[PDB]
Amino acid sequence: GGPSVFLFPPKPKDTLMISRTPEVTCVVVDVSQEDPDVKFNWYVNGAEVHHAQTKPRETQYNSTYRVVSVLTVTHQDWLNGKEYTCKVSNKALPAPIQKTISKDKGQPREPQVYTLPPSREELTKNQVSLTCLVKGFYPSDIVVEWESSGQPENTYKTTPPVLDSDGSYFLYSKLTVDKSRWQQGNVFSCSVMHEALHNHYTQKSLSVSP
Amino acid sequence: GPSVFLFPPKPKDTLMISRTPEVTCVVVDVSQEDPDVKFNWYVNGAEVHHAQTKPRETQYNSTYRVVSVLTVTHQDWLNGKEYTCKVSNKALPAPIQKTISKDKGQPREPQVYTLPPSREELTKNQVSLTCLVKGFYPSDIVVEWESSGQPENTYKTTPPVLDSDGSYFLYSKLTVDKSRWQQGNVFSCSVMHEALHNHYTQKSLSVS
Numbered sequence: 001g002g003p004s005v006f007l008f009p010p011k012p013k014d015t016l017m018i019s020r021t022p023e024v025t026c027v028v029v030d031v032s033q034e035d036p037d038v039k040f041n042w043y044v045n046g047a048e049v050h051h052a053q054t055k056p057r058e059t060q061y062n063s064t065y066r067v068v069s070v071l072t073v074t075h076q077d078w079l080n081g082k083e084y085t086c087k088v089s090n091k092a093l094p095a096p097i098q099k100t101i102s103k104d105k106g107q108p109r110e111p112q113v114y115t116l117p118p119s120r121e122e123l124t125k126n127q128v129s130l131t132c133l134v135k136g137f138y139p140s141d142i143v144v145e146w147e148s149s150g151q152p153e154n155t156y157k158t159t160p161p162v163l164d165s166d167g168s169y170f171l172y173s174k175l176t177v178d179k180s181r182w183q184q185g186n187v188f189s190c191s192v193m194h195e196a197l198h199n200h201y202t203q204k205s206l207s208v209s210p
Numbered sequence: 211g212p213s214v215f216l217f218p219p220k221p222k223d224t225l226m227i228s229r230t231p232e233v234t235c236v237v238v239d240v241s242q243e244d245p246d247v248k249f250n251w252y253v254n255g256a257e258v259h260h261a262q263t264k265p266r267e268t269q270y271n272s273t274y275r276v277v278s279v280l281t282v283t284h285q286d287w288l289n290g291k292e293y294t295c296k297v298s299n300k301a302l303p304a305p306i307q308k309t310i311s312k313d314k315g316q317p318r319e320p321q322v323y324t325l326p327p328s329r330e331e332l333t334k335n336q337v338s339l340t341c342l343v344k345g346f347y348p349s350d351i352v353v354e355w356e357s358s359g360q361p362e363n364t365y366k367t368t369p370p371v372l373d374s375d376g377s378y379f380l381y382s383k384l385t386v387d388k389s390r391w392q393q394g395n396v397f398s399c400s401v402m403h404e405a406l407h408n409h410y411t412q413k414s415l416s417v418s
């Protein structure tokens with residue numbers, strides 16, 4: 001065989017909100033038991049050591065080890081565009097293998113969010129769909145949630161971001177509720193966090209017309 | 211050695227009545243000498259006939275890329291027949307076979323609604339017009355926009371995402387100029403899907 005390494009960025013939910021600790025993950029996989037166990041190096045624009053913790057080794061049937069090193073990262077540093085490199089070296093490989101990842105390049109444009117009610121043609125069913133259009137943002141990392149009154153809602157789906165003709169991204173969020181629940185004036189809320197929003201968060205809400 | 215990928219027809223090929231749908235068995239990583247790959251095609255365990263080889267195009271990395279193609283009938287593929295391409299080669303210790311079909315499951319007919327621009331989108335120079343196509347299965351769908359008579363150009367469609375009830379849905383976004391939309395012009399969202407009456411529906415939208 002021949003081990004291979006994958007670098008994984010943090011988590012948009014974990015880099016945008018004030019509750020999660022973001023991190024970069026160097027996954028060395030297909031490590032054979034002959035000449036096992038690896039050494040990482042970790043560079044930040046060509047930098048250094050530090051807070052680089054390697055998580056517990058985990059065995060796979062595949063007659064092999066999978067081992068993961070994790071570099072915790074500040075929110076500011078990741079959103080600035082600092083480039084993180086993990087270089088893996090192992091006696092089972094001819095030369096060390098290096099991987100570098102960063103935030104997606106490009107000027108951040110901000111999302112415009114529009115709440116679309118249900119269609120008058122679909123208002124004849126028992127469950128109807130509230131649409132939230134989130135368009136014109138860059139990069140594609142965003143997070144979208146529905147909330148009514150105060151409770152987060154529970155039966156909604158969000159599309160992947162698809163590259164608009166402009167170079168910005170858009171997506172849709174659909175929340176299906178009961179027509180009775182909609183029509184009673186219940187106020188639902190599409191709420192988004194993204195890099196280019198003021199406070200990294202906006203919320204726009206939608207209720208039935210008069 | 212070489213490795214196989216079976217490929218289904220295009221939804222557009224198998225729906226629109228204007229194309230000819232095929233199943234594509236592409237053999238990758240076939241070597242220099244000891245090339246020549248044998249195909250065997252089976253339809254629910256059948257064989258022979260209409261299995262046409264496409265011309266050997268030499269890929270760079272010291273490799274040939276071989277491709278066999280089997281023409282299928284729309285009815286046959288949409289009824290859920292199982293096509294299987296098997297490939298024999300001297301480099302292989304035992305032939306490799308892959309089988310592909312249409313996605314299993316009871317076809318569900320797509321609901322399609324057209325959503326007009328949000329009222330705070332009525333300042334922006336370009337407004338967006340939404341088409342929500344929900345409650346269909348399988349995902350194999352085709353969505354186009356047209357206007358006046360001929361089709362429209364500035365629109366983008368989302369991928370089909372699995373819903374909570376086992377169906378699929380998608381969105382299409384057409385970008386029009388506010389003046390074109392407010393002056394009463396009419397746009398149309400046209401869907402092709404196997405569970406529609408006549409494989410086709412079109413719902414139109416205008417500034418009412």
Ligand SMILES: *[C@@H]1O[C@H](CO[C@@H]2O[C@@H](C)[C@@H](O)[C@@H](O)[C@@H]2O)[C@@H](O[C@@H]2O[C@H](CO)[C@@H](O[C@@H]3O[C@H](CO[C@H]4O[C@H](CO)[C@@H](O)[C@H](O)[C@@H]4O[C@@H]4O[C@H](CO)[C@@H](O)[C@H](O)[C@H]4NC(C)=O)[C@@H](O)[C@H](O[C@H]4O[C@H](CO)[C@@H](O)[C@H](O)[C@@H]4O[C@@H]4O[C@H](CO)[C@@H](O)[C@H](O)[C@H]4NC(C)=O)[C@@H]3O)[C@H](O)[C@H]2NC(C)=O)[C@H](O)[C@H]1NC(C)=O
Pocket residue numbers: 001004006007008025027029030060062064066099
């Ligand atoms: C031995 O067995 C093990 C385990 O067995 C099996 O594991 C899985 C896959 C299931 O099938 C199980 O049933 C089964 O037990 C094998 O382990 C796997 O090894 C492959 C080797 O390639 C890895 O594939 C890569 O996966 C990444 C994405 O991986 C994410 O998603 C996976 C789900 O599919 C998930 O399993 C991963 O853990 C990982 O999940 C992320 O994890 C991080 C941190 O843990 C977490 O923070 C994230 O939230 C989480 N995210 C998600 C979405 O889950 C995939 O991207 C890779 O694609 C590369 O390779 C393809 C071939 O080129 C190509 O199509 C891709 O574009 C990409 O290619 C590279 O791409 C970039 C540029 O885009 C660049 O770096 C490179 O230049 C380019 N080319 C190359 C050559 O690198 C790839 O598919 C599996 O992740 C891994 N699964 C594990 C460990 O669980 C092991 O390989 C087996 N070995 C043998 C010999 O059989």
Ligand SMILES: *[C@@H]1O[C@H](CO[C@@H]2O[C@@H](C)[C@@H](O)[C@@H](O)[C@@H]2O)[C@@H](O[C@@H]2O[C@H](CO)[C@@H](O[C@@H]3O[C@H](CO[C@H]4O[C@H](CO)[C@@H](O)[C@H](O)[C@@H]4O[C@@H]4O[C@H](CO)[C@@H](O)[C@H](O)[C@H]4NC(C)=O)[C@@H](O)[C@H](O[C@H]4O[C@H](CO)[C@@H](O)[C@H](O)[C@@H]4O[C@@H]4O[C@H](CO)[C@@H](O)[C@H](O)[C@H]4NC(C)=O)[C@@H]3O)[C@H](O)[C@H]2NC(C)=O)[C@H](O)[C@H]1NC(C)=O
Pocket residue numbers: 215217218234236238239269270271273275308
């Ligand atoms: C020599 O070079 C050529 C090409 O050169 C290079 O190609 C790419 C990678 C770029 O870097 C170029 O810049 C560069 O020039 C190499 O050719 C490629 O070789 C790989 C070998 O694995 C093949 O990978 C597979 O790709 C398919 C998807 O392929 C479609 O899309 C490609 C674009 O990305 C396109 O190039 C293909 O032609 C093909 O396009 C389709 O073609 C059909 C018919 O021709 C057509 O009708 C369609 O319209 C068209 N569609 C589109 C969108 O264009 C991918 O699906 C494969 O994934 C399998 O394997 C992965 C690893 O496990 C896994 O993630 C997937 O899930 C899937 O795995 C299988 O999945 C199912 C279960 O889900 C199951 O059947 C299997 O159990 C499971 N596992 C396996 C092992 O099958 C796969 O990644 C490329 O297609 C191929 N491209 C060619 C030939 O054009 C060549 O390999 C080089 N030689 C080397 C490296 O030695």
Ligand SMILES: [Cl-]
Pocket residue numbers: 318319345
């Ligand atoms: Cl239904």
